[PDB]
Enzyme design. Structure first.
Site, PDB file in Angstrom:
ATOM      1  N   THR A 146       0.809  -1.010   0.093  1.00  0.00           N
ATOM      2  CA  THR A 146       0.505  -0.368  -0.335  1.00  0.00           C
ATOM      3  C   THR A 146       0.938   1.436   0.042  1.00  0.00           C
ATOM      4  O   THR A 146       0.660   2.174  -1.100  1.00  0.00           O
ATOM      5  CB  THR A 146      -0.953  -0.103   1.552  1.00  0.00           C
ATOM      6  OG1 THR A 146      -1.874  -1.248   1.437  1.00  0.00           O
ATOM      7  CG2 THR A 146      -2.079   1.033   1.894  1.00  0.00           C
ATOM      8  N   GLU A 148       1.514  10.042  -5.278  1.00  0.00           N
ATOM      9  CA  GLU A 148       2.138  10.923  -4.973  1.00  0.00           C
ATOM     10  C   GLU A 148       2.874  11.031  -6.069  1.00  0.00           C
ATOM     11  O   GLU A 148       2.987  12.292  -6.342  1.00  0.00           O
ATOM     12  CB  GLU A 148       3.115  10.846  -4.223  1.00  0.00           C
ATOM     13  CG  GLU A 148       1.828  10.755  -2.715  1.00  0.00           C
ATOM     14  CD  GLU A 148       2.487  11.148  -1.521  1.00  0.00           C
ATOM     15  OE1 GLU A 148       3.228  11.929  -1.407  1.00  0.00           O
ATOM     16  OE2 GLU A 148       2.492  10.000  -0.531  1.00  0.00           O
ATOM     17  N   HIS A 169      -7.120   0.532  -0.649  1.00  0.00           N
ATOM     18  CA  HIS A 169      -6.803  -1.076  -1.288  1.00  0.00           C
ATOM     19  C   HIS A 169      -7.441  -2.183  -1.066  1.00  0.00           C
ATOM     20  O   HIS A 169      -6.832  -2.499  -0.202  1.00  0.00           O
ATOM     21  CB  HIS A 169      -5.307  -0.543  -0.635  1.00  0.00           C
ATOM     22  CG  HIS A 169      -3.789  -1.156  -1.967  1.00  0.00           C
ATOM     23  ND1 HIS A 169      -2.639  -1.767  -1.713  1.00  0.00           N
ATOM     24  CD2 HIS A 169      -4.102  -1.787  -2.921  1.00  0.00           C
ATOM     25  CE1 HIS A 169      -2.630  -2.071  -1.884  1.00  0.00           C
ATOM     26  NE2 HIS A 169      -3.055  -2.300  -3.303  1.00  0.00           N
TER      27      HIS A 169
END
EC number: 3.1.2.29
Lengths: 133, 133
Positions: free
Chosen positions: B38, B46, B72
């Site tokens: 994750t 990002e 996720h």
């Protein structure tokens, strides 16, 4: 474990948990300051919650982090101790949610919630093999 | 930057972006199935947002991740291509929020939001050094 209980997880940030170490592949990162990456902070928060819920798993079970929702409001250089506090928000069957926060001794660096799901490890492994090239 | 602006990048998950690689330190994570962490997915999301913003930063400006809020819900073994799309959803002052989503060619693996702040780089770096033990 009980709802509202708090669990603490301490981790001294080493030089290899900075932004550039998360993605050494990234030219667009390698000029970020040497600070604790958000992605590593997420991993630390998952790790804290994994420890917190360990006395809850049965043989053959693991867990997945299914959601992370946190701020990251102060930067942490290597050398500081980051303590994650995980507070159990709810537990029901295979689902568990936590309030999480992190502090580096100087600043609270972030907070929010995290959700995890208990899984049958072997069943999960098989599913992953079904996706493997 | 215009709300609605999208950027997409592709990433073949290599062996060293699995859970055990995010935190080798974790006796807990060492156990784990070989799937994209994750924390690494967050970093890739990002990374997409950083790239999308770059053209619009003045010299001496950088950005920082200030929030991440994603699900996720499907796991990804090494060898699959993860595609991440970032869409600018809002701009306010020094802050931008993106809608992010990821897909590994089989499943949509996660989605949510990511916020960043535009910062004066040097100033930020100096502050970090001043917080460094």
């Amino acid at each position: 474990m009980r709802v509202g209980e708090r669990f603490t997880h301490d981790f001294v940030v080493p030089p290899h948990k900075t932004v550039r170490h998360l993605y050494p592949e990234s030219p667009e990162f390698a000029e970020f300051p040497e600070v604790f990456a958000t992605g590593f902070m997420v991993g630390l928060m998952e790790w804290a919650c994994v420890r917190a819920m360990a006395p809850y798993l049965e043989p053959g079970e693991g867990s997945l982090g299914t959601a992370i929702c946190v701020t990251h409001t102060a930067a942490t250089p290597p050398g500081l101790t980051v303590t994650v506090t995980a507070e159990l928000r709810s537990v029901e069957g295979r689902r568990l949610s936590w309030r999480v926060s992190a502090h580096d001794g100087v600043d609270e660096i972030g907070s929010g919630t995290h959700e995890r799901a208990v899984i049958h490890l072997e069943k999960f492994n098989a599913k992953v093999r079904q996706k493997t090239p």
